[PDB]
Amino acid sequence: IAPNLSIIIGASTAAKIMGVAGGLTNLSKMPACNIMLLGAQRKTLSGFSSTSVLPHTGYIYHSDIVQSLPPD
RNA sequence: AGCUUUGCGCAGUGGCAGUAUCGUAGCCAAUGAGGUCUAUCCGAGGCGCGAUUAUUGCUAAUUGAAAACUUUUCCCAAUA
Numbered sequence: 001i002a003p004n005l006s007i008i009i010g011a012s013t014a015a016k017i018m019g020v021a022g023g024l025t026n027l028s029k030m031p032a033c034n035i036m037l038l039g040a041q042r043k044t045l046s047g048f049s050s051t052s053v054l055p056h057t058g059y060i061y062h063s064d065i066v067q068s069l070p071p072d
Numbered sequence: 073a074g075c076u077u078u079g080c081g082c083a084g085u086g087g088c089a090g091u092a093u094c095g096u097a098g099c100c101a102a103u104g105a106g107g108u109c110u111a112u113c114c115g116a117g118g119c120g121c122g123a124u125u126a127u128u129g130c131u132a133a134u135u136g137a138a139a140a141c142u143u144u145u146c147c148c149a150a151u152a
Contacts, residue, residue, distance in 0.1 A: 021112085034112040041097070056111055 013063040020059075036060045 002024055006014045017038050021027035027035065040058040060066060 031114070033114080037112055040111080052106080056113090057108090
């Protein structure tokens, strides 16, 4: 169904972003800035700073290629 | 026909700032730069390197000079 998007990112992240976005058409009609925020759980900072909780983070960030980078 | 909006030059007057302005045959960037607020939201340059009195010229003092110093075979000691 989505060969190019499965080539760029793994099919697990592909499925997790396609399901949460409402389908391939809805995800394709979504701005690029709103795709990085798909599946971003509002983790509650437990005393720690907001940066430690990694705010505004979604499937893309936790994908394999992005997680293969230094944290900075 | 007057008035008026925006952009752009050309000038004139005035104010403020000098820890900053400028450069890019370097790289990257609306096919997304860059993200602490408020992020299914913000949207523009950034990075590297180089120049410098932290933009650069003239103008006028002062100093350093510069022009000169005898810029020319002395002394301790020996003998006639």
